[PDB]
Chains A and B, each alone.
Chain A
Amino acid sequence: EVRDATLAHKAEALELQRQLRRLQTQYDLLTGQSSALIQGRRARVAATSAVS
């Protein structure tokens, strides 16, 4: 009866931490992996101008 007054906030509680851990695996983990191929673009077009 009264736990519904309290279990209600539990649903949103697990919602934001589930976001937060989804956020947590993406704060400093995006820059760790999304820049893996950034190094290529320096030489990925140097050879393009080389055939000219």
Chain B
Amino acid sequence: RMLEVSREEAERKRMLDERANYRHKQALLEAYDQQCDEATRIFAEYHKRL
């Protein structure tokens, strides 16, 4: 009757603590997309032809 398995606890830390600060990752994704954005920034007016 040891039918408890704390793998839920290991995932309790995992299940929704990500969403409690869901916007930490988006700040870094902005940094990763910054090189995409800055490349888009430098491909805007004269490099629009590119």
Interface residues of A (CB under 8 A from B): 26, 30-31, 34-35, 37-38, 40-41, 43-45, 47-48, 51
From B2, B3, B5, B18, A41 is in contact (CB under 8 Å) with B5
Q: Is the CB of B3 within 8 A of A48?
A: no
Q: Is the CB of B18 within 8 A of A45?
A: no
Map CB proximity to A onto B1-17 as digits: 1 under 8 Å, 0 otherwise.
11111111101101110
Q: Is the CB of B2 within 8 A of A48?
A: no
Interface residues on B, range: 10 to 19
Main secondary structure of the interface of A (DSSP, over half): helix
**Which chain B positions have C-beta within 8 A of A41?**
5, 7-8, 11
In the bound complex, CA of A37 to CA of B10 (Å) = 11
In the bound complex, CA of A41 to CA of B11 (Å) = 7
> Shortest beta-carbon distance, A12 to chain B, in Å?
26
From B1, B7, B9, B14, A30 is in contact (CB under 8 Å) with B1
From B4, B6, B7, A35 is in contact (CB under 8 Å) with B4
